[PDB]
Amino acid sequence: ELPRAFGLLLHPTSLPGPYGVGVLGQEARDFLRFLKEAGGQYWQVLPLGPTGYGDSPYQSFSAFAGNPYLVDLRPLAKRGYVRLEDPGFPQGRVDYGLLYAWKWPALKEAFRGFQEKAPPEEREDFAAFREKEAWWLEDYALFMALKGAHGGLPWNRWPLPLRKREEQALREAKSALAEEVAFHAFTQWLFFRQWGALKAEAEALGIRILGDMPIFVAEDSAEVWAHPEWFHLDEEGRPTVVAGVPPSETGQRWGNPLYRWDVLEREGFSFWIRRLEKALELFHLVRIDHFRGFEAYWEIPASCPTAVEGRWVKAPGEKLFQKIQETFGQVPILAEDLGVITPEVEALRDRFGLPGMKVLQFAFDDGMENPFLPHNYPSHGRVVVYTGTHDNDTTLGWYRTATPHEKAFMARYLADWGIFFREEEEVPWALMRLGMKSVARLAVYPVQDVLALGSEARMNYPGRPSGNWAWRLLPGELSPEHGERLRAMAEATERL
Template identity: 50%
Template sequence: MAHERASGILLHPTSLPGSGGIGSFGAEARIFVDLLHASGQRLWQVLPLGPTGYGNSPYSCYSAFAGNPLLINLETIAEEGDLLFAELSSLLPGDRVDFDRVKEHKLPLLKLAAGRFFEGENLERKKEFWHFCDTTFWLHDYALFMACKEHFRGKSWNSWPSELARRSLDTAALYSKKLGAVVGEQKYIQWQFFKQWHSLKAYANAREVRIIGDAPIFVAYDSADVWCNQYLFQLDEHGKPTVVAGVPPDYFSKTGQRWGNPLYNWKHLAEDGFGWWVARLKSDAGLYDLVRIDHFRGFESFWEIPAKEKTAVKGRWVAAPGEGLFKALCDSFDSLPLIAEDLGVITPEVERLRDCFGLPGMKVLQFAFDGGPGNSYLPHNHRRNCVVYTGTHDNDTTVGWFSGLSSGQKSHVCHYLRCKPEEVVWEMIRAAMSSVARYAVLPLQDLYGLDSGARMNVPGKANGNWSWRVGAQGFTDTMFVRLSDMSKQYNRVPG
């Protein structure tokens, strides 16, 4: 990590304004980058960019390597000639993402664009496409996985014919040929995603804005990652998980969180020199400037839940070989561009693993006002090598959080921040900005003072998350001016 103080905004691209029913890598993303640059913000944090599956969660994707087609900007494809602008006229407005409608609208257009590309005669573009295919090691497996899911009407891979489900090489080759056209469409879509993302990232970097990405520790069961690497996960003879991931009862849930992800077979990963993880984080390092490792404590020990259990209550902590993994990563990187999401039940062993490799942790101010003056989330207890947030995508907005406190808790918060109740949001922002923490990151919802209706995610709730958008009104420059003044005051603007 760079050593200067800096600040920035947490905003997932799906939340950007604009036509199409969902944010994209188009003009509005560049307008946002320009606002960040003009206000002295040098960080843009996003959630995982993978192709989302059930529940539209970016933490449950069909691949840890591929990109979400819904983030592709169709106007850019039309400018390249693979779509007609007239075909984009039915794009959807909206202040929230209706994922089903967006998929019904956007995915057929991407397939149409792919067909026109393959029928076209632009040899330079095709040369670029085939270079992408030849140099992207995971691409064919992912494209075949998605083609098979389409062929089998969305069924999970363990419901496919047994030889294909167990990924017999001969059977996989047979389906690659049989579904070749759809495989090609999937490769085209990924090519467009990565072209557009790298163009946007270059635009941001040229304006001194660095991107913080997000790498979930676990992957979805119904994913190309598990289908192609079944021996790296704890599965039974039928390919079903024997144990699944989650966390025990905590601040967010009285019964814990049963995420349901298959757990790694760490023995097999270690025997392979942790090659899958090295490849994954190298891929992420090519997408982002910094990577937040979600649920970092799972690299020291993880909560193992028998797959038959309906909640996370009956689980157990199992040791993980985090030190061996991070040593392997150090051998593959000049320096680890990582941030450790060290929230939740953190033990001295987890802290030692984090500190052994010099990884910055996270401080969330909404967690700071329980437990007295020794609470590690209070600004006066922060250390330099960390990233401070008012809240994250899993928290309520600060307005919503504060309104849900008791009168005594509200008085305690206001006494610490030395402010009136109506001033709490910006004083929380000030507390983050003035912290000794190297980086301060604020959810855009807090910058605008939005209530719980703008919350991004409620942990443990299966549906209705991830849909908040900035809205048709676009961005409000006034708030960025105020943020700029505060960033300068607390030495978070370079120079």
């Protein structure tokens, strides 16, 4: 049963620090301390898998793998395994192109330095790690090695014996890319080691990490390559059908491969169990995006170019949750239940006592019936209230672009709830207060709203080709005063 509490949303890439990206190092511990001192008990992150073109966490090369960019290199550099220099990284922003060019070589150099110089004790735990994680790691490491060797081409575009995973081809590829396979394995060992320490620190400080996973994996991913039967795939490995959302007047065609649920059901939903178990190592709770898919999913033929063409298909959510509940003794899922929802989807979520999402930015476009208005929140309180999501703008940016109706209805509503503001920079704080006063057990706020940043700090702008996933905190930006303001709000709203 969720405690009445508050959290902050921050993806690790946004953390401050050198070498062009936030890493699992001292700055992350600093953030946890701030979160602790501010009286927060929850840290939310976006997916932590390896990113492709477009740098999206929501399109990953592995469901299981950690992001190589989040690995801190400074512990290696202190050991003398690598020498790090700054190529001219921007501050307050991730430049992924510079990062791609510098970090991957940095990681390789570190690996070579480790293999030469590392103590045998270290080299044993790396060796022990590879054997333990082999069930996912072997394929991941090879998928990455093959990808570089095949010039970033998707696995669907690879030569056929490799694509179909014929044993001889697999064996010969591993021998040919054995140094590469070892390297990708090393990146993971570092990742899981560094996150394991970080999670330990959090737990000590009484902080639970909220993870994030998309319901659908990407087409260009190790698991899809590894287990094609699980996916609806043609002989070529091209999806016969693609994930999407029905008409959003156009609808949306995402392109993601859909699961052969029957196959998974036969298998006791093994992929999902493993996926969650791996997530639970990193996280305390796991939000699943497009959670509605578990009830039913919109199936679009791949040949069809638009979202309008497909059909709805029923999915065995009930069964999957029954298996989860029986395996873990619990269903540790936050349901992303935003957008068009059905009584069926609500039925499933409430059956497993799963908490749902609420977003305050959505709340003032309608009338008082609007579900995102606190008074309409369920009494059971199993909801996480957000000022905004990673796909939405910052609250201050939203307030600068919002309609006169929205702005007036908001001010009035706040006023009724006893919340007043004299400035637009105060608006994010007022909205944070509105969520804290609500019945919602958890209120999770992005750091950009704590800082009252404008639209320059938007994590993701849907429909914008560049500049996404790049926002970074500056060192020291999250001042003690910010923390003291949060703590006071939490005392006043009984979230301490």
